[PDB]
């Protein structure tokens, strides 16, 4: 049951936009809402509006009086001397709650005229006509206007609606909540050479009487929220999908072949999401818009998605096809379960984020294989256990503070840190995988189909929300639908992993009792760390003995420590028979390293990742080597690679080398075995016999049979030896001699890989392989032996580093004339120049990176150069570079770059709270408090980034470096 927090119900909204002026960056328009009051004596009506100048408001064609105030413009007063962050977080939460449409509130308060009170008490319709104007928007609509001359279509100027969550208040007045569903009528009067893309279906396109402008009329009969309404106006090249004909793809001019190749996969994503769920795609059209200077890499609205143009690749670009493919897939998953089925509160957001991430993981499983699915699930689980042990924990479904261990309030999406938002979505889809583990996948897809079917029976009624609230899901409704389809309720699993905000830590060690033939496990939990919680459920453990692989369920109550499980025979060591594996197959194992008295070959605690856990198991090194070689699970091979770094014995070198030589191993395991072999080789110097590690293996796999030092000409058509070939010198460059310097046998090998590179014969590009070659050249740089702080000049350069510097100079200059796909070699060469500057080789001068961080460059070059400037101002304690970065945060045209500068200055801070630095003035505290209070008031993501930066630099209490 859904009861509105608003005293009115909104039925229909007309959004008309005229006079989109690109020179002056200005729009004019009106908005006409059709509300039905649910309570009599409505009097004031409270709507949401930011940055719009409200000209006039007429209610039922009668002139009404409005008052506007935004408390989130300046959160705390300018003349308050408070400088602690808990004060700002409480004031910012109160300010966002005072404009919240999820309460009754709002920023624009319109007073109902007196003569309509007899129209409002007996509950009859009210039609509110606001007309507004955006004079030069700092948020919401982003105007990308290039400085080439010509007409606005000839130079490539466009507008798009940017922002996250409820940010539609930034470009027209609305009820900007996900729970106020209404039908829509959208008119946009644009130039005759431009096209206006928006939500709904385009009913017509009429000309103006001078035929210089045309009006696009859109209609949206599926009741969506105001937060799902978008806009993209530009000189877009239109491409109808040749497979599905209601799907149109819009790109920027001159990028039509890239659009043709890139969006050619999307029909398979549509077919997948419509056959695992049994509902068809709910909207009547689908539109993909590719734009420049995007807010996020992929945004999903109702019947529309806005991607950045940096996803567009051609047919000869690999290492970008899977990333763009999965961006399209998660946009479509959010089309199904973020835009059609919406949110009932700010709680129950974990339901939608979990269903979106879970069905996108099912797509990844079918498309890229179960092994890529397991690797992705393991990397997401490692991400969340790292974040939750780092700071507190992520609390899905809080109850309204519920989480006081962290420096922001979790009551609203616009007060969350961006890393918390990312980990929120990550934990939501892992908890949905856990619900699939308890209640099987076919019942899970039946739950999702029941939700979609209730929403689509709801979506066709005309009753104003008598039935339109069946399109809003809640937690209680989701659990009730689960209990309807399965008969089991998941309330212990919901109580543990949703309502409680923690992950578990397992420390395991075994001992084999030879007398009674049992395996005595010893599993203890660390439950006193700040991020942890105590697990009391069951726990699966998989033991591989000589007779095969056996699963055991252990009951781990609070007082439990020793778990005795039984062991089988050892009669497959009496005769040589094959040892049967986890799957149905069996292999020949070399049992010379195994103990004579124990049959068990390896043990895995929680193999299926059925809890949110971090396992620290103490096996013997031969058990880790057997688990690396003969396991049929990629997460166990990865964890054995990760645990073999502590055992540098030559049997582990043989194990990793046999993994590296082995095709029919998953390629991301061999790419990890490269770096593990490099670390082991560094640890057993003065024992290593022959050549450096992986060199003979590289010449055996990727070089000519007649010439060992000449590499084969590039043929990248295998896509697994391409990735292994481009990752093996990067790990090989981490080799070090007894003198702690990279050997001149590996550096010469990398330089010969660079010289003899011929790419005139493959059908694929070479930009990522050459960029990884520059990364391998950067990995070999050891710190220089400066004497008496000698100035680093050209004559006293290292003889090794002069070759590296010549190569990166040649590569960067050749990129200036023949550019790569996304300037990958510019990014790699800037990263390598920063590596050479971090050691004492090149003079520590930020002027090159400051010239590459200007506005007109590509955004990857910009963020690489700004990363180099952030690293410089951390190491050299530069005041003027920090003022340069803070000025670039305040006034840069691209808001993604501002968010990225705040992000990089949070990750690599110039000082922490513990450090005494020269950059701990009252002036810097006043600048960052002014940046939290004012200055970042237009983005909701820059303000949370400024809160994160103030927390990283000065902590939760009063800045110490202050009177």
């Amino acid at each position: 049951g859904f009861e509105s927090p608003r005293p009115y119900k909104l039925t229909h909204q007309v959004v008309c936009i005229n006079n989109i002026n690109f020179q002056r960056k200005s729009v004019v328009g009106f908005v006409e809402l059709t509300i039905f009051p649910t309570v009599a004596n409505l009097n004031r009506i409270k709507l949401n509006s930011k940055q719009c100048r409200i000209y006039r408001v007429r209610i039922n064609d009668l002139e009404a009086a409005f008052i506007y105030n935004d408390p989130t413009l300046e959160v705390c007063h300018s003349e308050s001397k408070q400088r602690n962050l808990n004060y700002f977080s409480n004031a910012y939460a109160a300010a966002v709650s005072a404009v919240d449409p999820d309460a009754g509130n709002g920023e624009l308060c319109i007073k109902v005229p007196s003569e309509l009170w007899k129209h409002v008490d007996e509950l009859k319709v009210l039609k509110i006509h606001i007309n507004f104007s955006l004079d030069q928007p700092k948020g919401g609509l982003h105007f990308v206007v290039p400085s080439v001359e010509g007409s606005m279509a000839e130079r490539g100027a466009h507008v798009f609606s940017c922002g996250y969550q409820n940010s539609t208040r930034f470009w027209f007045p609305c009820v900007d909540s996900y729970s106020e569903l209404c039908t829509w009528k959208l008119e946009f009067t644009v130039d005759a050479a431009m096209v206006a893309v928006s939500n709904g279906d385009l009913v017509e396109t009429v000309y103006t009487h001078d035929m210089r402008k045309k009006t696009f009329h859109y209609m949206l009969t599926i009741p969506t929220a105001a937060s799902n309404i978008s806009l993209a106006i530009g000189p877009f090249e239109i491409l109808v999908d040749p497979y599905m004909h209601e799907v149109t793809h819009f790109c920027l001019p001159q990028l039509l072949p890239l659009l043709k190749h890139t969006t050619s996969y999307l029909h398979e994503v549509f077919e997948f999401y419509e056959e695992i769920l049994t509902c068809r795609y709910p909207y009547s059209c689908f539109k993909t818009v590719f734009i420049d200077e995007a807010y996020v890499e992929v945004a999903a609205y109702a019947s529309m998605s806005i991607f950045s143009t940096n996803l567009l690749h051609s047919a000869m670009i690999i290492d970008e096809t899977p990333l763009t493919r999965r961006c399209l897939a998660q946009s479509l998953a959010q089309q199904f379960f973020g835009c059609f089925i919406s949110r009932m509160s700010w709680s129950d957001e974990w339901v939608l984020k979990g269903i979106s991430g879970y069905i996108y993981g099912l797509w990844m499983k079918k498309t890229f294989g179960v092994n890529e699915y397991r690797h992705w699930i393991k990397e997401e689980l490692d991400k969340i256990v790292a974040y939750e042990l780092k700071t507190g924990g992520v609390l899905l479904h809080p109850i309204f503070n519920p989480a006081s261990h962290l420096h922001f309030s979790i009551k609203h999406p616009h007060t969350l840190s961006w890393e918390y938002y990312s980990m929120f979505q990550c934990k939501a889809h892992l908890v949905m995988r856990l619900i699939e583990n308890r209640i099987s996948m076919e019942f899970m897809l039946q739950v999702f189909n029941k939700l979609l079917s209730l929403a689509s029976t709801a979506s066709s009624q005309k009753f104003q929300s008598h039935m339109w609230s069946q399109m809003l899901v809640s937690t209680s409704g989701f659990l009730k639908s689960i209990s309807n389809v399965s008969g089991k309720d998941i309330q212990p699993l919901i109580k543990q992993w949703v309502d409680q905000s923690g992950v578990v830590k397992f420390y395991g060690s075994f001992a084999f009792n030879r007398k009674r033939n049992v395996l005595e496990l010893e599993i203890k939990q660390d439950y006193t760390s700040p991020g942890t919680q105590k697990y009391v459920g069951p726990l699966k453990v998989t033991v591989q003995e000589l007779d095969g692989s056996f699963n055991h369920t252990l009951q781990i109550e609070e007082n439990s420590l020793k778990h005795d499980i039984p062991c089988h025979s050892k009669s497959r060591r009496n005769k040589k028979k094959k040892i049967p594996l986890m799957n149905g197959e069996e292999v020949d194992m070399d049992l010379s390293a195994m103990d004579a008295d124990s049959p068990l070959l390896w043990i895995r605690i929680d193999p299926d990742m059925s809890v949110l856990r971090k396992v620290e198991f103490e096996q013997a090194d031969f058990m880790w080597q057997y688990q690396l070689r003969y396991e049929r699970d990629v997460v166990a091979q990865q964890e054995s690679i990760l645990a073999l770094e502590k055992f540098p014995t030559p049997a582990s070198r043989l194990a990793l080398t046999d993994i590296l030589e082995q095709e029919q191993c998953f390629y991301r395991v061999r790419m990890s075995a490269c770096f593990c072999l490099a670390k082991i080789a560094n640890s057993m110097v003065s024992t290593w016999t022959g050549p450096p590690a992986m060199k003979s293996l590289f010449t055996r796999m990727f070089c000519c049979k007649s010439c060992p030092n000449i590499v084969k000409t590039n043929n990248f058509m295998s896509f697994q030896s391409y990735f292994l070939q481009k990752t093996m010198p990067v790990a090989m460059a981490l080799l070090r001699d007894v003198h702690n310097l990279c050997p001149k046998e590996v550096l010469t090998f990398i330089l010969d890989l660079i010289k003899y590179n011929d790419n005139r014969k493959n059908k694929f590009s070479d930009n990522y392989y050459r960029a990884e070659m520059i990364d391998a050249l950067a990995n070999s740089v050891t710190p220089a032996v400066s004497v008496n702080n000698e100035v680093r000049t050209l004559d006293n350069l290292n003889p090794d580093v002069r070759l590296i510097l010549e190569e990166i100079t040649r590569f960067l200059n050749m990129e200036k004339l023949l550019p790569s796909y996304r300037h990958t070699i510019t990014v790699s060469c800037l990263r390598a120049i920063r590596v050479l500057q971090k050691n004492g080789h090149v003079p520590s001068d930020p002027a090159l990176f400051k010239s590459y961080a200007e506005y007109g460059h590509f955004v990857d070059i910009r963020i690489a150069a700004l990363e180099a400037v952030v690293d410089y101002t951390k190491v050299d304690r530069s005041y003027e570079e920090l003022q340069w970065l803070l000025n670039m945060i305040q006034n840069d045209p691209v808001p993604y770059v501002r968010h990225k500068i705040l992000n990089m200055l949070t990750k690599n801070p110039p000082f922490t709270k513990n450090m005494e630095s020269p950059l701990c003035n009252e002036a810097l505290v006043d600048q960052l408090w002014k940046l939290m209070n004012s200055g970042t008031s237009h983005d909701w993501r820059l303000r949370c980034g400024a809160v994160d930066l103030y927390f990283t630099l000065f902590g939760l209490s009063r800045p110490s470096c202050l009177p």
């Binding site: 143009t309 051609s314 460059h857």
Partner: peptide, 25 residues
């Protein structure tokens, strides 16, 4: 300037056209 000269970075008015577009096709 004699040893290791770098061509100076010039800003483009539209950078995606010189980044994303293929030149040999």
């Amino acid at each position: 300037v004699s040893t290791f000269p770098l061509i100076a970075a010039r800003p483009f008015t539209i950078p995606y056209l010189t980044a994303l577009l293929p030149s040999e096709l």
